[PDB]
Write a protein that binds this ligand. Structure first.
Ligand code: HEM
Length: 153
């Protein structure tokens, strides 16, 4: 359970993401696809992308980064009270997309990397630790829902 201070550090850096959701989403998905190319196989409209310029020119990738960050922002703003936001996400990710917990770890590392690269002043060790806790709680709760749905990914 994060402290109120930790949630405030999470939501403070998140306000910087909200100034340009699409550009942050592109940098996060590009980092995930470049660091873990096996993840790109889950995206039918983007699986052919090779270079960073191709990834930045992709309308599908730019739209999907916004899809992901819109959902994650709503989850972070619930400050751990996110059962109703996690329920539909666990449903699709366990039964349709089949996204293993290791892939959620990969995208978490990509989020932390981009926030540290773009906003180092608002992402020092205090804020990095608070965001790490917030993404770890997200993964823990989604893993338990995955198992409830019969998915052991
Ligand atoms: C922070 C973690 C993530 C969040 C908040 C997130 C959120 C979403 C949301 C809101 C959607 C659209 C609604 C739905 O189908 O549930 C979606 C679709 C999808 N997500 Fe995720 N996702 C996350 C992580 C991942 C990861 C790591 C992968 C793959 C490596 C993934 C693969 C997919 C795919 C394949 C679709 C369908 C895309 C399409 O057909 O256009 N997601 N995700």
């Amino acid at each position: 359970v994060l402290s109120e201070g930790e949630w405030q550090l999470v939501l403070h850096v998140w306000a910087k993401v909200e100034a340009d959701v699409a550009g942050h989403g592109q940098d996060i998905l590009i980092r995930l696809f470049k660091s873990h190319p096996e993840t790109l196989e889950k995206f039918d409209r983007c699986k052919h992308l090779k270079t960073e310029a191709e990834m930045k020119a992709s309308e599908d990738l730019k739209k999907h980064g916004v899809t992901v960050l819109t959902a994650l922002g709503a989850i972070l703003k619930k400050k751990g009270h996110h059962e109703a936001e996690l329920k539909p996400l666990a449903q699709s990710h366990a039964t349709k997309h089949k996204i293993p917990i290791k892939y959620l770890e990969f995208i978490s590392e990509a989020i932390i990397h981009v926030l540290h690269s773009r906003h180092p002043g608002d992402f020092g060790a205090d804020a990095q630790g608070a965001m790490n806790k917030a993404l770890e709680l997200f993964r823990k709760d989604i893993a338990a829902k995955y198992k409830e749905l019969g998915y052991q990914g």
